[PDB]
Amino acid sequence: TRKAVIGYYFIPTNQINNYTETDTSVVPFPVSNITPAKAKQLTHINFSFLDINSNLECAWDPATNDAKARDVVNRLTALKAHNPSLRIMFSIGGWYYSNDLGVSHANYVNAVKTPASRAKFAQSCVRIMKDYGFDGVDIDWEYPQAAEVDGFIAALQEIRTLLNQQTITDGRQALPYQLTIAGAGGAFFLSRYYSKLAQIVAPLDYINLMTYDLAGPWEKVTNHQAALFGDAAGPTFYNALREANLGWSWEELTRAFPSPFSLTVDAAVQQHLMMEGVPSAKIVMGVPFYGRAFKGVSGGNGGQYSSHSTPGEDPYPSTDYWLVGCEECVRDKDPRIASYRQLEQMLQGNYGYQRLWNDKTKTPYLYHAQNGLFVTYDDAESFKYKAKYIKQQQLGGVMFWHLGQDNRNGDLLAALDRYFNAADYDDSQLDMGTGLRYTGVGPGNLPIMTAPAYVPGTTYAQGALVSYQGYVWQTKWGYITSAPGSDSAWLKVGRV
Amino acid sequence: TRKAVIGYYFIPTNQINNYTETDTSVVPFPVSNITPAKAKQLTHINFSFLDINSNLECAWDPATNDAKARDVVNRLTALKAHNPSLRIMFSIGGWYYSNDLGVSHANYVNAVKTPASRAKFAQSCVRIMKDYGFDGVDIDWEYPQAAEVDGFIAALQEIRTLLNQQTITDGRQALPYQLTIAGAGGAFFLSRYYSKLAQIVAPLDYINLMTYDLAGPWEKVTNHQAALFGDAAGPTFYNALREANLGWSWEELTRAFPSPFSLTVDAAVQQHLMMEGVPSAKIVMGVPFYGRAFKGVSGGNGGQYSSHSTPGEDPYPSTDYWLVGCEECVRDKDPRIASYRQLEQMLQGNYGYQRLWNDKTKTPYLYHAQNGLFVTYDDAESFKYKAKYIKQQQLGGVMFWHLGQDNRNGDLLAALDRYFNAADYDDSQLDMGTGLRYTGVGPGNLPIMTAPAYVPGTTYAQGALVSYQGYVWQTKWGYITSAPGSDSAWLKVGRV
Ligand SMILES: COc1ccc2cc3[n+](cc2c1OC)CCc1cc2c(cc1-3)OCO2
Ligand SMILES: COc1ccc2cc3[n+](cc2c1OC)CCc1cc2c(cc1-3)OCO2
C-alpha cells in the first residue's frame, strides 16, 4: 500500500482575491508551480484554510472573492489529470481561526455542541466539498478541550456518514471521499483529547500529526523543532499526558508517561500507538518545510540548547529583521521563520551560516557565529531517517506544511517520494543512531507474553505472572486471592 | 459527646456449647469477668461471630446449641442494668468466615447481589437482633472487592432503613439501634473499596478501623503491629491506594499517596479523612489487646526490624511452642500470638523478657535476648497517645479486639475509659513525639486557599494560582489558555 504524501497548499485571502501566476510579489507560489511531476509525487493536497462562521457552518473567509476562489480550486483539481490517485482536500481551521484566543474559536465550540448543530455543520462540510469540487474534508481545530471532545467526535462521525453516502451516490468507490484531521504532535496540547484518541480516529482515514513546532521562541532554550529522537544534552519537558483524563492507575500512568521526557517526533508517534484502537496505518507524520530562527544565542553547542533573546509573541512585535540574508523574512515581517527555499539560498550566499548536523536527533541546524543565530529546520537528509521510521513503524505516510516553502526544484517533496517509492533507493543500512527513543508502554503496545493461566482459589505472591482474558498480568504486592481485572493488585503487562 | 469504647467479646462455638463460669480450662473469659465497673467503662460490646448461611441469611454457626447461645447473650445484655448507654451489638463475619478463601465467603458475595437478596438478608439481620436481644448490627466482612461494593452499600442502606423503623416501633429513641462495620486498617485491603468510602459510611453510626495486625510473621521483617506514627528506621510499604480506581491524575495520586510509606494507625486514619464525605466523628480507631511474637530475631535494636524464623501459615504448622512463659500458646497451640494478660504474666515471671519503648511509634515491645524473641503489643502507655490522637483528630472513639485478652483486673479497658472520661486525668502536656505523620492530601482535606478569580481570555504561566468554581487551582505548565477543571493543565490545590 502506497504511503500517503499530504502537502498543504496555503493561500491567504488577499492572494486569492488578487490571484496571478505572473507576479511572485503578489502570489509567491501559484498553482502553476505544482508541475505534473510534483502532482505525481503527492497523494493529497490540503487546500487551506476555510473556517466555521457565526452560523456554525463551514465557510470561506467572508472577505473571499468567490469567483477567484473557485478558479484557484479548479486549477488545483485540474492536477488530477496528472495523477489519478491525487485528492484535493480542503482544511477547516488552523491556528489563526481556531486556537483558544483566535477569531472564530467560539464557532468551533458551538458547532459541535448539539445533535442539531453537528448535523447542520456536517451537512455544510459536504456541501462545500461538492460545490467547489474537493475530494475530502480535513479539520484542523487547534485544539478541542476535554469537555468538547465528545461533541467533536460525534461531528466527525456525522461527516463520515455523509461522506460514505456521497461516495456511493457519486460512484467514487475507486477514490472514496476522505476525512482527516490535523492532530497535536506534542504532549501538552495532545493531553486535551488524548484519552479519547480511539473514538477520534475511528471515523478518520488519517490523523496527520503536527510533529513540528516542538521548539520555538516561546521556549527559553533553543532546540530542534522536529527532532526524530532525543538528545540527552537537550532540554526535557513535563509529560502532560500523565495528567490526561484516562482513569488509569499510578503504575499504568508512570510506565506510559516517563517525565520529564524528550519532546520528539518519535515520542508523539509512540504516544499515539500506546492507546488501544489507534492503528499505525492511520497515523501520518508531519514534517516542516520551514525552519525556526533564534537570535542572541551563545557558543559551545553550535547554538543548540542556549538561552536567547528572541521575542515569542505574534505578530512579530518589532521591525528588526535580523536573520541575515532572509529576504522572505523582510517581505513577511518576521525573521523567526524561513522557508527551506530561503534557507537554501542563505546557505549558498556566503552570509556566514554553517550547516551542522545532530546525529542523535537526526536533524540539521544552522549556526551563525558572528551574529549569534540558530536555525532549526529539516532537509532531504533528515527526511531519510523520518521516512525509514514511517516504514518501520508501519505508519500511514507523511504530511507537510507547506508546498510553497519547498525550493523551486521541489527537492523536499521529491525526496519524500523517492524514499517511499523509488526502486533504486535502499535504506536497509541507514543508521537510525543512538538518540533517545520514547520508552513508555501502554495498553495499545503491550509486549506479547506467555504465562500460566490464572487459577481461581490460588494465593499469589508478589511478582507472579498469570494469563487471563487474553492478557498477562503481574501482582504488585503479595498474598493475592482476587482475580486479574477484579482487584487493583494486578497490573496488565502483556498480551497473550 | 462521649467517645465510643467498643469491645469485642469473641467466644467460639465450643465454648458457647460448654459454657461455664467455673472452669478457665473450658471457658477462659466468661461474661462474669465483666464486672459492673467494666460494664460502665464500655459503650458497646460486639458479640462475635455470627455468619451468613447458604440461604443468604444472617445465622448462628449451625453447630451452636441455641439455648446456650441465648444464655451467653443474656449474660451480656444483663450488663445493661449497670450502664444505660451500653449496647450489645452482634458482629457478622470475621476473617475465618468471610475472607476470600473462608468457609462462608460466597454467602457474603451472593447475599448483597440483588434487591431481593439484600432485602431478605437485611430482614434476617433485624430478626436475629430482636430474637436474641441485641442492640445493633456490626458487619465484619474482610473484605468486599470492588465489584461487590455497590451491592454491599445497598445492603447497608437496607439494614439502616429497617433498624430505624424498628427504633420507632419499639420506642427506642433514647438508645436507637445502630449499624457499624469493621473496616480495613492497612492500605492493601483498604484499596479494595477505598474509592467508595463515602457511600459505605453514610448509613453507619461508625466504621471501626482494624488498625492492628500491621505487622506479622507473614512479613519478612519484624515491626510494630500498631505503630501510631512512623519510625524512619522501620520498614516501609508500597502504598496500594495509588492503584485504587479513583480516576485521579498522576499529580493527584502522588500527592495523596506517598510511597513507600509507614504503615501506621495515623496513616489509616488520615487516609480515611482524605476522602470527601467521611466525617471524623464516624471513624473509630481499633487497638489490639494482644501481641504478636517472632522467633529468630537479631539483636542491636531490641529485635526491631530484624529478620526472623517464624512460620506464617495458618494453622500453626508445628508443635514447637518457643515463646517461653506463654501458657496460652500451648493451650491454643500457636506461639505467634499472646494476650496482654499472658504477656504481663511473662513480664512478671522473670523469664528473660525486657520491656522496651519506641518513642517514635509510641508503642512498647518485648525483647528476649538469649533465645532471640520479639513481641509487638500495646499497653496503657501506648493507649495514652492513641487516646490523645482520637481527641485531637475528633474521631468517634476506640474499638478493641478483644475483651477476653485484657488482664483479670481489666487494666487496658480501664485505661481507655480513664483517658477519655476521668476528671483526674490530664493529657494536656502529653508530648506526641516526632514520629512520621502521614501527609497525603486529597479531596477531603484540601486546605482553604485564596487566589484571584480566573479571567477568561488570559494566558497563565506555570505555577499560577486562580480561584474558579469553588476551588483554587494551579497550572502545571505554561501558556495556559484553558479554564480550570476544563483541562489537564490545572491542578485542584485548595478550596475557596
Ligand atoms: C507551545 O504552544 C504554542 C505557542 C504558540 C504557537 C504558535 C503557532 N503554532 C503553535 C503554537 C504553540 O503550539 C505548541 C502553530 C503555527 C503558527 C503559525 C502562525 C502563528 C503562530 C503559530 O502566527 C501566525 O502564523
Ligand atoms: C499478608 O497477608 C496475610 C496472610 C494471612 C493473614 C491471616 C490473618 N489476617 C491477615 C492475613 C494477611 O494479611 C496481611 C488477619 C487476622 C487473622 C485472624 C485469624 C486468622 C488469620 C488472620 O486465622 C483465624 O484467625
Q: What ranges do the domains of chain B cover?
A: 1-288+379-446, 289-378, 447-496
8-state DSSP, A144: -
Ligand 1 atom closest to the Cα of residue A96 is 24
Q: Residues preceding discontinuities in chain B at C–N > 2.5 Å?
A: none
C-beta separation of A380 from A412 below 8 A = yes
Nearest-CA residue for ligand 1 atom 15 is A95
**CA of A189, nearest ligand number:** 1
Ligand 2 centroid to Cα of residue B142, in Å, is 10
Ligand 1 binding pocket mutation candidate from A10, A48, A91, A95 (most atoms within 8 A of CB): A95
Q: What is the 3-state secondary structure (H, E, C) of chain B?
A: CCCEEEEEEECCHHHHHCCCCCCCCCCCCCHHHCCHHHHHHCCEEEEEEEEECCCCCEECCCCCCHHHHHHHHHHHHHHHHHCCCCEEEEEEECHHHHCCCCCCHHHHHHHCCCHHHHHHHHHHHHHHHHHHCCCEEEEECCCCCHHHHHHHHHHHHHHHHHHHHHHHHCCCCCCCCEEEEEEECCHHHHCCCHHHHHHHHCCCCEEEEECCCCCCCCCCCCCCCCCCCECCCCCCECCHHHHCCCCCCHHHHHHHCCCCECCCHHHHHHHHHCCCCCCHHHEEEEEECEEEEEECCCCCCCCCCCCCCCCCCCCCCCCCCCCCCCHHHHHCCCCCEEEHHHHHHHHHCCCCEEEEEECCCCEEEEEECCCCEEEECCCHHHHHHHHHHHHHCCCCEEEEECHHHCCCCCHHHHHHHHHHHCCCCCCCCCCCCCCECCCCCCHHHCCECCCCECCCCCCECCCCEEEECCEEEEECCCCECCCCCCCCCEEEEEEC
Smallest CA separation from ligand 2 atom 5, residue: B218
- B479/A147 touch (CB, cutoff 8 Å), yes or no: no
3-state secondary structure of A445: coil
Residue A479, ligand 2, Cβ within 6 A? yes
The whole-angstrom distance between A124's CA and the closest CA on chain B is 28
Contacts of B141 (CB under 8 A, 6+ apart): B92, B93, B98, B108, B152, B181
Q: Which of B97, B100, B79, B99 minimizes the C-alpha distance to B88?
A: B79
**Are A192 and B488 an interchain contact pair (Cβ–Cβ within 8 Å)?**
yes
Does residue B479 line the site of ligand 2, with CB under 6 A?
no
One of B57, B142, B148, B158 is an active-site residue; which one? Answer: B142
Do residues B247 and A247 lie in contact, with contact meaning Cβ atoms separated by under 8 Å?
yes
Q: Is A244–B488 a contact, with Cβ atoms under 8 angstroms apart?
A: yes
Q: What residues of chain A lie within 8 A of the CB of B476, using their CB?
A: 238, 240, 243
Known active-site residue A142: yes
Burial class of B150 by CB neighbour count within 10 A (0 to 12, 13 to 18, 19+): middle
Do residue B250 and residue A240 have CB atoms under 8 angstroms apart? Answer: no
Nearest to A145 among B238, B477, B486 (CB): B486
Q: Cα(B397)–Cα(B391) distance, rounded to whole angstroms?
A: 8
Q: Which of B314, B333, B337 to mutate to test the pocket of ligand 2 (most atoms within 8 A of CB)?
A: B314
Q: Is the CB of B95 under 6 A from ligand 2?
A: yes
CA A339 to centroid of ligand 2, rounded, Å = 70
Distance B96 CA to ligand 1 centre (A): 64
Give the whole-angstrom CA distance, residue A483 versus residue B149.
16
- Cα B79 to the chain's mean position, in Å? 25
Write the residue in B147, B243, B479 that is nearest to A250 by C-beta: B243
Name the experimental technique.
Answer: X-ray
Mutation target vs A (from B243, B459, B479, B492; most A CBs, 10 A cutoff): B243
Q: How many angstroms is it from B279 CA to the middle of ligand 2?
A: 28
CB–CB contact A238 B476 (8 Å): yes
